[PDB]
Write a protein that binds this ligand. Structure first.
Ligand code: FES
Ligand code: FES
Ligand SMILES: [K+]
Ligand SMILES: [K+]
Ligand code: NI
Ligand code: NI
Lengths: 198, 198
């Protein structure tokens, strides 16, 4: 089971406007490996990337032994033509269920001051920060490096999807923000990569 | 089957020396999820990161239904405490087999001029360029973005491990250098991300 072809085109209007952006989208895969049941979960900013991404996804291809439901990706667009497609985890809410995920208030303590936003319980800290237009560090986006490291000051997180931290570090409050969901209101100090690996 | 804890520490001597680096290492996983049969494949530069990485890997943890052989990761160390662990694909050669993989000459045509090095048939273009001390762009390292894009001018590649390019783009000569192996001598123009997604 794996992706074969997942091309995304860069919308010329975004390029022209000098807009960076982000789409999170859910889809199913058929036993033939084609993509259907596509639903945009979020698009930042709105009306620039979503429609084009859905069009592109019609031509995606996977290899699979059976249909697969409720896949989710993040599609990030940055300056100078950069696009990346990152796999995330589907939830009841991503699949299109009735009602809204519980959401919690995230307080980030950043080198340039504090910021606060809502984060659904099925969205990673990083993603919700990006949706609020905050620029947090990252590189792998796969819970497998130090880039997105922060320190949890209060509250509780689910970091089941991370892997670069050991037991000890999690217990000491370390967080990989690309792979962590809030399960309460939380306060996280960001930009702590260098402190993590020291 | 998945990684749970893969902590790597930053060697203080590397920090002090202002050295960036890279280790590629093979290991097996036990049915208990512990790591054994560890062998460094390459370390750049030598004698700075390898021994410490092997020590760290003794404490790694996986979840698994059965033992798994001949896993390989790349471990990259950059300035300001950055470490990332990226999964790659094992080969006869990574497992420790007799004799050497066939190797091919890679010619890179970079914005700052041309460079040439050997690349084994079981090592990705990006990795071999990094081992030769060339700084090529990348971000996901998972064949799922535009960052490492180049244009294949001559020769042939295996890009089975990539997924962001479609059929058409591969046929036109596009290459994701983080996920491409040479199967002949090749010439690749690098730094073509913006041209790819345009
Ligand atoms: S960006 Fe690598 S662990 Fe979050
Ligand atoms: S770095 Fe993303 S495809 Fe190579
Ligand atoms: K379905
Ligand atoms: K073994
Ligand atoms: Ni613990
Ligand atoms: Ni073709």
């Amino acid at each position: 089971f794996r992706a074969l072809h997942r091309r995304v085109n860069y919308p010329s209007r975004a390029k022209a406007l000098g807009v960076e952006g982000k789409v999170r989208v859910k889809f199913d895969i058929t036993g033939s490996g084609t993509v259907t049941n596509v639903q945009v979960l979020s698009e930042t900013p709105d009306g620039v990337f979503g429609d084009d991404v859905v069009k592109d996804m019609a031509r995606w291809r996977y290899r699979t032994e059976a249909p697969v439901e409720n896949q989710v990706v993040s599609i990030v667009f940055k300056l100078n033509g950069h696009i990346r497609v990152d796999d995330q985890q589907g939830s009841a809410g991503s699949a299109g269920s009735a009602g809204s995920a519980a959401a919690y208030k995230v307080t980030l303590v950043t080198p340039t001051g504090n910021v606060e936003f809502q984060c659904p319980d099925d969205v990673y800290i990083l993603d919700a920060a990006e949706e609020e237009g905050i620029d947090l560090p990252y590189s792998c986006r796969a819970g497998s490096c130090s880039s997105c490291a922060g320190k949890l000051k209060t509250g509780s997180l689910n970091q089941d999807d991370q892997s670069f931290l050991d037991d000890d570090q999690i217990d000491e409050g370390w967080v990989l923000t690309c792979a962590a969901y809030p399960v309460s209101d939380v306060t996280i100090e960001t930009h702590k990569e260098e402190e993590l690996t020291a």
